[PDB]
Amino acid sequence: PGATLCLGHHAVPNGTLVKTITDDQIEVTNATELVQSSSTGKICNNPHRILDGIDCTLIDALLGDPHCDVFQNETWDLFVERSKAFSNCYPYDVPDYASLRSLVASSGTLEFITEGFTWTGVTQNGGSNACKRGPGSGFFSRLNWLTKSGSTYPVLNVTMPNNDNFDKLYIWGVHHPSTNQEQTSLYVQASGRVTVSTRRSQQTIIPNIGSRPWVRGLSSRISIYWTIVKPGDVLVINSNGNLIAPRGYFKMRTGKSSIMRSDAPIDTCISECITPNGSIPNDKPFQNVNKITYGACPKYVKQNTLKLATGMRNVPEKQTR
Amino acid sequence: PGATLCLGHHAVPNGTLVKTITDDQIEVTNATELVQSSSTGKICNNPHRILDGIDCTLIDALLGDPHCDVFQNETWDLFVERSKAFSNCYPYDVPDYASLRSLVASSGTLEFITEGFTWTGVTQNGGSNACKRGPGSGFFSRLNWLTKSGSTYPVLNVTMPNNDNFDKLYIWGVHHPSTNQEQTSLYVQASGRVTVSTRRSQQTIIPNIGSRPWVRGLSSRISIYWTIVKPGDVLVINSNGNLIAPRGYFKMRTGKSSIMRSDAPIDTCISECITPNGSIPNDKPFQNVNKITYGACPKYVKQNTLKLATGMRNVPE
Amino acid sequence: PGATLCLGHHAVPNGTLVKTITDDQIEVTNATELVQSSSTGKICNNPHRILDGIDCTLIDALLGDPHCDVFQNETWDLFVERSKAFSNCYPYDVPDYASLRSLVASSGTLEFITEGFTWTGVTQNGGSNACKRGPGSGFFSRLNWLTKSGSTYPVLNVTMPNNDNFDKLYIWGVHHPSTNQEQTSLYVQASGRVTVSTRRSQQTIIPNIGSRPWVRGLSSRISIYWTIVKPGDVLVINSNGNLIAPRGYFKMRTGKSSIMRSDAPIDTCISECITPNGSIPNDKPFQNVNKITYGACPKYVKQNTLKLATGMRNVPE
Amino acid sequence: GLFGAIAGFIENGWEGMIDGWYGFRHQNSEGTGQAADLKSTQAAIDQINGKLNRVIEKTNEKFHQIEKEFSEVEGRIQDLEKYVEDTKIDLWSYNAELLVALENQHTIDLTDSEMNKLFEKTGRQLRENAEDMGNGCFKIYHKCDNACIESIRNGTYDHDVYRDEALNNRFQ
Amino acid sequence: GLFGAIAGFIENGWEGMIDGWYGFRHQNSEGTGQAADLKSTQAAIDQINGKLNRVIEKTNEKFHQIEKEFSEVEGRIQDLEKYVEDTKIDLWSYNAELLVALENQHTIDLTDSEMNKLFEKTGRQLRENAEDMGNGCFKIYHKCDNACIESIRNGTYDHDVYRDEALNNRF
Amino acid sequence: GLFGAIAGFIENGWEGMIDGWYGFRHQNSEGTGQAADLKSTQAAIDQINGKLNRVIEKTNEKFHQIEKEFSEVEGRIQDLEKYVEDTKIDLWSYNAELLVALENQHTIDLTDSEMNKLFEKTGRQLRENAEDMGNGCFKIYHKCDNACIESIRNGTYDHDVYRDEALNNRF
Numbered sequence A: 001p002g003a004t005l006c007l008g009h010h011a012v013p014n015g016t017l018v019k020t021i022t023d024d025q026i027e028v029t030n031a032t033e034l035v036q037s038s039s040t041g042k043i044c045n046n047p048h049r050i051l052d053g054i055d056c057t058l059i060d061a062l063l064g065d066p067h068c069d070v071f072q073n074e075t076w077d078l079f080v081e082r083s084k085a086f087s088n089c090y091p092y093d094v095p096d097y098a099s100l101r102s103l104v105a106s107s108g109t110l111e112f113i114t115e116g117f118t119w120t121g122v123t124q125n126g127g128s129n130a131c132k133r134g135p136g137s138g139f140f141s142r143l144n145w146l147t148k149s150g151s152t153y154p155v156l157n158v159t160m161p162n163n164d165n166f167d168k169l170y171i172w173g174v175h176h177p178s179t180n181q182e183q184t185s186l187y188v189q190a191s192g193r194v195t196v197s198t199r200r201s202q203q204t205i206i207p208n209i210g211s212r213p214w215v216r217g218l219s220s221r222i223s224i225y226w227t228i229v230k231p232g233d234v235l236v237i238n239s240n241g242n243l244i245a246p247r248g249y250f251k252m253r254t255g256k257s258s259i260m261r262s263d264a265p266i267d268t269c270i271s272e273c274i275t276p277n278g279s280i281p282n283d284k285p286f287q288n289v290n291k292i293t294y295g296a297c298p299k300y301v302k303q304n305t306l307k308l309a310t311g312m313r314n315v316p317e318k319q320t321r
Numbered sequence B, C: 001p002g003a004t005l006c007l008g009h010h011a012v013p014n015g016t017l018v019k020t021i022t023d024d025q026i027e028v029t030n031a032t033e034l035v036q037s038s039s040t041g042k043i044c045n046n047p048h049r050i051l052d053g054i055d056c057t058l059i060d061a062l063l064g065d066p067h068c069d070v071f072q073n074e075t076w077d078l079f080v081e082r083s084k085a086f087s088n089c090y091p092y093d094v095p096d097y098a099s100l101r102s103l104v105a106s107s108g109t110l111e112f113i114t115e116g117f118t119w120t121g122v123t124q125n126g127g128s129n130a131c132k133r134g135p136g137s138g139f140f141s142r143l144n145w146l147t148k149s150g151s152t153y154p155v156l157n158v159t160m161p162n163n164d165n166f167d168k169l170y171i172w173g174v175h176h177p178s179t180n181q182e183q184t185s186l187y188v189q190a191s192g193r194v195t196v197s198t199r200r201s202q203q204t205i206i207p208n209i210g211s212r213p214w215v216r217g218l219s220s221r222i223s224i225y226w227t228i229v230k231p232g233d234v235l236v237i238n239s240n241g242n243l244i245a246p247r248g249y250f251k252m253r254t255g256k257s258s259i260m261r262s263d264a265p266i267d268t269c270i271s272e273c274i275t276p277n278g279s280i281p282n283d284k285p286f287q288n289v290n291k292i293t294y295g296a297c298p299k300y301v302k303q304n305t306l307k308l309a310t311g312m313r314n315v316p317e
Numbered sequence D: 001g002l003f004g005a006i007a008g009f010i011e012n013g014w015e016g017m018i019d020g021w022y023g024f025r026h027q028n029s030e031g032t033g034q035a036a037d038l039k040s041t042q043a044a045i046d047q048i049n050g051k052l053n054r055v056i057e058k059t060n061e062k063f064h065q066i067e068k069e070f071s072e073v074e075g076r077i078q079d080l081e082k083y084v085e086d087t088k089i090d091l092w093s094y095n096a097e098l099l100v101a102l103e104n105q106h107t108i109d110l111t112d113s114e115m116n117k118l119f120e121k122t123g124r125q126l127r128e129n130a131e132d133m134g135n136g137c138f139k140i141y142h143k144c145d146n147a148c149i150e151s152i153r154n155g156t157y158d159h160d161v162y163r164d165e166a167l168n169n170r171f172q
Numbered sequence E, F: 001g002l003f004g005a006i007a008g009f010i011e012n013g014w015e016g017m018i019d020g021w022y023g024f025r026h027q028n029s030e031g032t033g034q035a036a037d038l039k040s041t042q043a044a045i046d047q048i049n050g051k052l053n054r055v056i057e058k059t060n061e062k063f064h065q066i067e068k069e070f071s072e073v074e075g076r077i078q079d080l081e082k083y084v085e086d087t088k089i090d091l092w093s094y095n096a097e098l099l100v101a102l103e104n105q106h107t108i109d110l111t112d113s114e115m116n117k118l119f120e121k122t123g124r125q126l127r128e129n130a131e132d133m134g135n136g137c138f139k140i141y142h143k144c145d146n147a148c149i150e151s152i153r154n155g156t157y158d159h160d161v162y163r164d165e166a167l168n169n170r171f
């Protein structure tokens, strides 16, 4: 007589292979995926304030390209630049474009405060047929193209102190004519000069006359620069020709704002994590969707799958089949 | 009549919670803290040579601002720059200030060797009331403000070969007048130019004439540049106005020297690890005081506490 | 009567030490080294295409220094620059030398395509005795030194569209004269200017006149610049003096090519991983030979040895 | 695994045990039966749930960072930006690979361990009334009805009650 | 823990054992007593000293590095300097979190192991003179006075001396 | 190790066992002999080879990177390049140090475990015919000739055949 009492454990018909210290592939009863490898293809419009650039880069919205006028005073957590964006104003370059783009994107606002600059002895509000605003010639909204008044272009020496308790971002420029005829016809002097300075720093740009590739009707160019004025400092502008003047300053902020290149459409949903491919869930610790991310995101890794065992070793009963 | 023998382990009345692979909070008999999260608030003056900048930035001590004259030929392991520091000489800027500050800080010395430059046909030792030395006008001790002699300023073209077996650091400058009257009054020529070169490098600076915001009474400025001359190389300085000439060179070293921004006072004690908050002990492997450190320091982490179990699971009675 | 049955494990008389969580030194029966710490001292010429610069830096081969003419038709996976290389043409500097060296090394070719620039009203093909070719004066093969024709140097204004589907690299320069007399003698205008542009960006250089240290007979200099033109973009060059003109473009590629400074000799063998000390095997996951590597390499670590236990604890009799 | 039970002296798992991770199967005078052990099941599940929640302890949050794709060739600064990111990605990929390997080795060992604890706990209960057959089964040397089997499984088995009967069957 | 002794078949710890980490308690004809076991205590102690000294294997030494706080907005170069540092700090923060989780799991298992080792060693010592009660206690089937108890504790217990007496009481 | 066999209740290893990692030594009526156990040897060998091949799982491939040696003083950009590289090297050196430490603790523990598994396997095989002496040796309470020894080692030992003979010697 007697009895038998056998101890045992379960097994499942369909285990999953995982990796361990000793095995590259060994079978357990269950596992869970640690790498997020898919996106919806859409950027969720909440909880971050997403600003679709549409046809406009951030820089073109900053300068005030007319087809970007709709972005005046805009704010964002994430500015989204589309590959369809285009410029449609005066042809320009920004030496250190990437830094200006970065510092504006991080500031998260285009809030612009007009200031009463006094430009004695010059003509203001120059325009071009390459930057149409309505039916007539026009210019970047936030910039003031100064040229000679009557027969003279005086040495300009203007000042704008910062009496506020916030930093001012000033955007300004220098115009490069294509011919000596343009230089003297617009600025009298055969060679211009623009010096912008604060108490601790200064920038001096000398224009160069000559042809650049034809763009939107023009072989001439404008070069864009910027200056930050802290509280208690003062902006001084010194120029005897070729100045592209600011009309005021942009307010600067610090916060969570950034910028992203993406063609993904913006949808009404909720997602903390955004990639150029679209939003992704952040419940997993890793992701293989894109190394470019914004928000509360899983860490990017190279693996497309990583299985964490959630069960014991699966040892099926051996069969004679 | 038999006996009983029970095997067991100790426990303590109040253990401490630690984290494991499977539990974020489980109780063991004892643990030890792995994150240093406090400081004395003071920088210990040993074992590193600490140089308190007091009222002076490293750059102002380098150029030779008069209230920084006491720092001449000084050396340091760690130069400490204070937030109360101020400049009190000619208003200036350094393009790539951060790199000049870094390369001098890492060299660890202000040792300056005067060299016999000959400046033919110009006046030496220009000064300003914005940079007084005693009651009279003065200038940065290590720079030589050259102006016209009589009614002329000739083209200067001078040479200084490096015949030593070490690198020389030369600090020089360009003066930016505020008006054309200053320009021709000081340098005769209506437009200056400064070219400083070695065999492998060259820099030409054109002064910008015009008004800048008032600083210590002046709307003019000086811009500071530097040139390193290796053994066997040669310094050439070429200028027809606005040169702020070097008086010699700084000796360069390589080593453990650095610079730190801090207002922690300096105390007489011993500590290997220095943060802007003050010295911290380095017995623990991690620290949460400051990501800025100098010396043998625990690694900076985000956690304010991490408990290493030093005992078994605590199972109280 | 009965029997005894003992269970046991093997041992060796003298094991090897390994590190664990609890022990810096514990003896096991066997271990294997995880850190590659030696090199053969030679760079194996397979499987990567090795190009020995010998006497030439990559930049001097790019410009066409005459003793580097042999590299015109060359390509590489790894360009090897030797510490004995020397320049022997017109004295020059490259602002952002390191970036130009890097983008060329990464392109892996010096393939040069000549373009028919029309330089109206100037003399072409200037040379110097500081850059000898045969019995005469000469110049960088890929650059075209323009000077006045007759008594005039007109405003040069040429364009070159990129209608290919690859990027074009243009190398150009600016000549810095040593005196005003050579300036006007070569270019008529008292002040030169070189503007090179594409649709979205531009570079403007003003030449610098002045005396520099003597190099191969000359106090003057050339500064080297570059411009990449993408498909569908356009190059424009505009100048009224001192232009060192491109003769064409370098075809750029993208790929696995790089550059390394090394004096290790090149040998006939096979090795995936290259360091400046020579090739190293890559069977181990770590290496202590050099943080500079090329190829499928172990990761660089500071330890010169790390032992992975491959056996049990060694308990000798 | 380190303890030698799962995939060890226990030949295989039971696909028919669907209500628990570890359990008992018995044969006695009243037939055969199967029952899951809740305590051992719970101990392993709590630990795996514990480590799972530690791993997914929610993610870091990043906003403005560096650029990681580039439309122009630039040289030194872009080399460094790419190198910084590639370095970061390689180190995180290494961290992820080491994490799952360590976690999974430990999960196989801890589930192995719970099987062994249940087996040793059962044997201590039976004292001198049973012998270990070596395959996870005990031969019980006395008549053990369903009530008696249940008493073993719920921890209320009084070994003294059957000790005399079992000792005579064991020794002869 | 992996071995099922501490917080396992041993129900709780002894707050009264202040002279060791592991030990013995007995009841016999002469009363009750407690004694710490030095060898098992030291084995766990030596091991914990080992890992503690590895973790406190002192810190690296750094001098001039990069700047990590900035008073002006600069853009690209400063974006990278900040990102480099923030990347470093996250990786070290992860290393620290993982280090203590692995270390502490292992410390609990190794001390659990040493408890189990002492219990197994004792049972082997007693041979057929005792039975495991399942709670970390052995029932000893023979007269075992204080001299007999200490002999078990110091490893000089001759099981053959009591084997006949003990076998007769068991059966 | 965690299991207390190697450098535990087994006093030392056998320098004379050259054909396997674990094994048997016996003394019976026919003399003494030694034999290795293949299955346990394989289990340890197999697992150590497994972890070795995971560790040396081939290397990453890198081509153009950043410069890491510099012939001139430059300041800010060069400070960052060196700091990036120094940061990377310290994190990898830490990874290598931790990897080897974790692997090596585990290699010692798993080999200890395999010794223990063989010992428990043997004892379960012997049932009531043997007693654990506490030093890794079994006293076998019946005549066990060389064939009988082989039967234990190759897993075909029928305990019931000797149970009567062994029980009377034990009790």
Ligand SMILES: CC(=O)N[C@@H]1[C@@H](O)[C@H](O[C@@H]2O[C@H](CO)[C@H](O)[C@H](O[C@@H]3O[C@H](CO)[C@@H](O[C@@H]4O[C@H](CO[C@]5(C(=O)O)C[C@H](O)[C@@H](NC(C)=O)[C@H]([C@H](O)[C@H](O)CO)O5)[C@H](O)[C@H](O)[C@H]4O)[C@H](O)[C@H]3NC(C)=O)[C@H]2O)[C@@H](CO)O[C@H]1O
Pocket (backbone or CB within 6 Å): A126, A127, A128, A129, A130, A137, A145, A147, A150, A151, A176, A177, A178, A182, A185, A186, A217, A218, A219, A220, A221
């Ligand atoms: C009594 C007396 O002396 N009075 C003075 C006036 O004569 C003088 O006016 C100028 O006089 C000259 C001759 O003396 C000439 O008539 C000028 O007219 C220009 O004509 C050329 C040829 O047709 C034409 O050039 C074309 O420009 C286009 C694009 O040009 C715009 C543009 O859309 O960008 C037109 C904009 O209004 C203009 N804006 C400003 C602020 O000047 C811009 C700008 O000039 C450039 O973009 C700067 O780079 O140009 C294209 O480039 C074609 O290829 C090119 O042929 C100009 O457009 C005509 N100028 C204007 C203003 O329309 C005339 O200006 C006056 C000022 O000097 O002073 C009086 O005292």
Ligand SMILES: CC(=O)N[C@@H]1[C@@H](O)[C@H](O[C@@H]2O[C@H](CO)[C@H](O)[C@H](O[C@@H]3O[C@H](CO)[C@@H](O[C@@H]4O[C@H](CO[C@]5(C(=O)O)C[C@H](O)[C@@H](NC(C)=O)[C@H]([C@H](O)[C@H](O)CO)O5)[C@H](O)[C@H](O)[C@H]4O)[C@H](O)[C@H]3NC(C)=O)[C@H]2O)[C@@H](CO)O[C@H]1O
Pocket (backbone or CB within 6 Å): C126, C127, C128, C129, C130, C137, C145, C147, C150, C151, C177, C178, C182, C185, C186, C217, C218, C219, C220, C221
């Ligand atoms: C009627 C009339 O006036 N016609 C004009 C011509 O006169 C004029 O030719 C120039 O005329 C002047 C006199 O008016 C003079 O004679 C020029 O000859 C130069 O003489 C100086 C003095 O000895 C001599 O300087 C030496 O130069 C070397 C370096 O020399 C080279 C070199 O190898 O680098 C020679 C190269 O050919 C030259 N290459 C080019 C493209 O010009 C280069 C180059 O100019 C420099 O590298 C620029 O930095 O220089 C060294 O510097 C010694 O220290 C120095 O003494 C020059 O070498 C002579 N120049 C030449 C070309 O031989 C004479 O040329 C003509 C052109 O200006 O215009 C007519 O209208």
Ligand SMILES: *[C@@H]1O[C@H](CO)[C@@H](O[C@@H]2O[C@H](CO)[C@@H](O[C@@H]3O[C@H](CO)[C@@H](O)[C@H](O[C@H]4O[C@H](CO)[C@@H](O)[C@H](O)[C@@H]4O)[C@@H]3O)[C@H](O)[C@H]2NC(C)=O)[C@H](O)[C@H]1NC(C)=O
Pocket (backbone or CB within 6 Å): A178, A179, A211, A212, A213, A214, A215, A219, C157, C158, C159, C234, C236
């Ligand atoms: C320096 O050299 C460059 C290149 O030689 C030169 O720029 C070129 O100018 C021509 C004008 O002569 C540009 O031609 C334009 O091409 C666009 C197509 O992209 C056309 O849309 C334009 O056609 C209209 O406008 C013309 C105005 O002249 C009309 O005549 C015509 O019927 C159309 O209505 C226009 O032809 C050419 O694109 C540029 N090339 C480049 C590469 O930029 C420049 O002018 C020279 N500078 C000097 C000072 O000579």
Ligand SMILES: *[C@@H]1O[C@H](CO)[C@@H](O[C@@H]2O[C@H](CO)[C@@H](O[C@@H]3O[C@H](CO[C@H]4O[C@H](CO)[C@@H](O)[C@H](O)[C@@H]4O)[C@@H](O)[C@H](O)[C@@H]3O)[C@H](O)[C@H]2NC(C)=O)[C@H](O)[C@H]1NC(C)=O
Pocket (backbone or CB within 6 Å): B157, B158, B159, B234, C179, C211, C212, C213, C214, C219
């Ligand atoms: C501005 O000042 C400069 C420095 O004085 C002037 O440059 C000097 O110009 C002279 C002639 O014009 C050169 O003389 C030549 O020198 C070589 C020797 O070359 C080198 O040899 C030794 C090795 O023993 C080396 O150590 C030196 O540094 C030399 O550079 C002679 O062999 C020739 O015969 C020839 O005469 C000087 O070399 C040169 N010096 C430098 C440092 O450049 C320059 O001319 C002045 N500018 C003006 C416009 O006047």
Ligand SMILES: CC(=O)N[C@@H]1[C@@H](O)[C@H](O[C@@H]2O[C@H](CO[C@]3(C(=O)O)C[C@H](O)[C@@H](NC(C)=O)[C@H]([C@H](O)[C@H](O)CO)O3)[C@H](O)[C@H](O)[C@H]2O)[C@@H](CO)O[C@H]1O
Pocket (backbone or CB within 6 Å): B126, B127, B128, B129, B130, B137, B145, B147, B176, B177, B178, B182, B186, B217, B218, B219, B220, B221
């Ligand atoms: C030589 C002199 O003192 N001339 C008188 C002018 O100084 C004065 O104009 C005022 O000058 C102020 C600044 O003056 C100094 C200075 O920096 O302290 C005086 C120094 O001697 C002079 N040094 C040299 C080597 O020339 C220095 C220099 O010219 C400038 O710093 C160059 O930028 O200037 C300040 O600028 C006042 O705003 C200005 O009005 C005039 C009229 O008051 O009288 C002169 O006699």
Ligand SMILES: *[C@@H]1O[C@H](CO)[C@@H](O[C@@H]2O[C@H](CO)[C@@H](O[C@@H]3O[C@H](CO)[C@@H](O)[C@H](O)[C@@H]3O)[C@H](O)[C@H]2NC(C)=O)[C@H](O)[C@H]1NC(C)=O
Pocket (backbone or CB within 6 Å): A030, A031, A032, A033, A310
């Ligand atoms: C074994 O592990 C897998 C994970 O790999 C488990 O599958 C998961 O089961 C949960 C059930 O709660 C699923 O979550 C649910 O999703 C629905 C929508 O799909 C949602 O509405 C619920 O609120 C809940 O979140 C999860 O999707 C599923 N994952 C996968 C990949 O299938 C499985 O249950 C585990 N099995 C055992 C026996 O533990």
Ligand SMILES: *[C@@H]1O[C@H](CO)[C@@H](O[C@@H]2O[C@H](CO)[C@@H](O[C@@H]3O[C@H](CO)[C@@H](O)[C@H](O)[C@@H]3O)[C@H](O)[C@H]2NC(C)=O)[C@H](O)[C@H]1NC(C)=O
Pocket (backbone or CB within 6 Å): A157, A158, A159, A234, B211, B212, B213, B214, B219
């Ligand atoms: C360009 O315009 C600026 C601003 O109008 C002029 O700078 C100003 O110059 C005056 C000089 O009289 C400075 O005034 C001084 O102020 C101190 C106290 O601050 C006072 O005690 C002195 O008696 C003196 O008057 C004023 O600060 C300064 N403004 C700034 C912002 O620096 C400059 O002179 C003009 N230059 C030209 C060439 O037009």
Ligand SMILES: *[C@@H]1O[C@H](CO)[C@@H](O[C@@H]2O[C@H](CO)[C@@H](O[C@@H]3O[C@H](CO)[C@@H](O)[C@H](O)[C@@H]3O)[C@H](O)[C@H]2NC(C)=O)[C@H](O)[C@H]1NC(C)=O
Pocket (backbone or CB within 6 Å): B037, B038, B039, B276, B277, B288, B289, B290, E069
């Ligand atoms: C050592 O010194 C550093 C820097 O001097 C200290 O870090 C600073 O800590 C304070 C508070 O602990 C931070 O204050 C901030 O206040 C704002 C406004 O209320 C708030 O939004 C922030 O969340 C934060 O609380 C300050 O920003 C921070 N500075 C830096 C650069 O991190 C550190 O706490 C000191 N440690 C010790 C132990 O003294």
Ligand SMILES: *[C@@H]1O[C@H](CO)[C@@H](O[C@@H]2O[C@H](CO)[C@@H](O)[C@H](O)[C@H]2NC(C)=O)[C@H](O)[C@H]1NC(C)=O
Pocket (backbone or CB within 6 Å): A037, A038, A039, A276, A277, A288, A289, A290
């Ligand atoms: C997310 O988007 C990235 C690109 O933005 C995808 O990766 C690219 O895939 C293309 C396919 O043709 C490759 O040619 C590129 O080399 C890839 N780029 C990089 C940087 O890896 C990626 O596959 C997308 N992921 C998902 C899930 O959609």
Ligand SMILES: *[C@@H]1O[C@H](CO)[C@@H](O[C@@H]2O[C@H](CO)[C@@H](O)[C@H](O)[C@H]2NC(C)=O)[C@H](O)[C@H]1NC(C)=O
Pocket (backbone or CB within 6 Å): C030, C031, C032, C310, F052
């Ligand atoms: C000690 O361990 C190493 C690693 O397992 C053994 O080296 C291997 O030896 C075999 C031949 O026996 C080779 O095929 C492998 O390529 C070697 N591996 C490595 C990583 O080198 C070594 O033989 C062992 N020594 C002893 C005495 O067992």
Ligand SMILES: *[C@@H]1O[C@H](CO)[C@@H](O[C@@H]2O[C@H](CO)[C@@H](O)[C@H](O)[C@H]2NC(C)=O)[C@H](O)[C@H]1NC(C)=O
Pocket (backbone or CB within 6 Å): C037, C038, C039, C276, C277, C288, C289, C290, F069
């Ligand atoms: C590989 O080459 C490097 C670079 O030359 C060697 O590192 C140098 O070693 C010398 C002598 O020990 C030191 O004085 C230098 O400070 C080292 N330089 C650097 C940059 O680290 C390295 O030792 C060589 N290694 C082998 C195995 O050949």
Ligand SMILES: *[C@@H]1O[C@H](CO)[C@@H](O)[C@H](O)[C@H]1NC(C)=O
Pocket (backbone or CB within 6 Å): A072, A073, A111, A112, A113
């Ligand atoms: C932008 O904001 C400022 C301040 O809030 C305001 O004065 C200005 O009119 C605004 N401009 C637009 C176009 O909304």
Ligand SMILES: *[C@@H]1O[C@H](CO)[C@@H](O)[C@H](O)[C@H]1NC(C)=O
Pocket (backbone or CB within 6 Å): B012, B014, B029, B030, B031, B310
């Ligand atoms: C914990 O740390 C040490 C023991 O190593 C000792 O100083 C301290 O009293 C311990 N605390 C407890 C509660 O055991």
Ligand SMILES: *[C@@H]1O[C@H](CO)[C@@H](O)[C@H](O)[C@H]1NC(C)=O
Pocket (backbone or CB within 6 Å): B072, B073, B111, B112, B113
């Ligand atoms: C500075 O440098 C040296 C000593 O190293 C000496 O020539 C000079 O006089 C020193 N001056 C001072 C003030 O120490």
Ligand SMILES: *[C@@H]1O[C@H](CO)[C@@H](O)[C@H](O)[C@H]1NC(C)=O
Pocket (backbone or CB within 6 Å): C069, C070, C071, C072, C073
């Ligand atoms: C490059 O190729 C051409 C034609 O294929 C050849 O004639 C020329 O000599 C080659 N140049 C070199 C430096 O080998």
Ligand SMILES: *[C@@H]1O[C@H](CO)[C@@H](O)[C@H](O)[C@H]1NC(C)=O
Pocket (backbone or CB within 6 Å): E146, E147, E148, E149, E150, E151, E154, E156
């Ligand atoms: C062990 O215990 C016995 C009796 O309890 C005692 O007499 C003896 O001194 C102890 N030590 C040794 C080494 O025997």
